[PDB]
């Protein structure tokens with residue numbers, strides 16, 4: 767089960783991905799998460815990516831493709847994987863084609879979680895994340911049982927640094943320019959699947975899960 771999740775900032779990649787990996791046990795690979803992990807560990811990669819991430823800009827293709835190529839070669843991707851937020855540019859998509867062709871693991875489905883851009887600002891500014899496990903909540907749409915703490919581990923919740931009005935707007939602008947070219951690319955490949963992500967989380971997942979049977 768080789769999957770790719772794409773969508774505009776805040777569309778629900780992390781939320782849907784969490785559910786996919788629990789049911790199928792494939793590794794959840796988020797380039798966003800990888801960059802932030804690096805930023806925390808303060809590796810040279812982390813510091814370099816930080817400049818772009820903080821501004822809402824895309825981290826350059828070369829270094830991004832590099833960390834994904836290495837990640838996909840790990841033993842835990844033997845039975846499949848869930849790419850989240852990558853590819854994000856046609857260039858990345860073409861590179862991934864070569865990478866998976868070398869690894870012998872072609873993509874089964876590219877799932878595009880479609881959400882109207884006009885509601886994404888609310889989704890991100892209201893997002894709260896667990897500092898311990900990374901699962902996300904929303905002040906209005908999916909609030910924690912107790913304000914400021916994770917239902918699972920009791921860890922303190924926080925607001926991602928780039929989830930502010932200015933940066934969110936920038937992220938939306940930047941990623942808007944990549945959507946259509948990416949959709950056309952995979953639609954041409956023959957395995958693009960569009961899912962209406964503007965419904966309750968479990969309703970969205972039902973459609974996502976419908977695509978995974980037999981993989």
Ligand SMILES: Nc1ncnc2c1ncn2[C@@H]1O[C@H](COP(=O)(O)OP(=O)(O)OP(=O)(O)OP(=O)(O)OP(=O)(O)OC[C@H]2O[C@@H](n3cnc4c(N)ncnc43)[C@H](O)[C@@H]2O)[C@@H](O)[C@H]1O
Nearest residue numbers: 775776777778779780781797798819825851854893903904
């Ligand atoms: N390939 C690449 N190339 C170059 N640069 C790269 C790169 N990949 C990453 N980067 C860099 O890294 C940065 C960060 O990347 P990344 O972390 O991947 O940013 P993103 O694409 O903007 O996605 P988000 O994490 O913000 O949102 P999501 O879709 O997972 O949503 P979630 O499930 O949390 O949901 C959001 C909120 O909505 C709520 N929610 C979820 N579903 C619903 C629903 N159905 N109804 C109502 N609310 C919902 C949630 O509770 C939550 O509060 C980029 O800006 C870029 O700089």
Ligand SMILES: [Mg+2]
Nearest residue numbers: 779780796798
């Ligand atoms: Mg995410």
Ligand SMILES: [Zn+2]
Nearest residue numbers: 896899916919
């Ligand atoms: Zn947690």
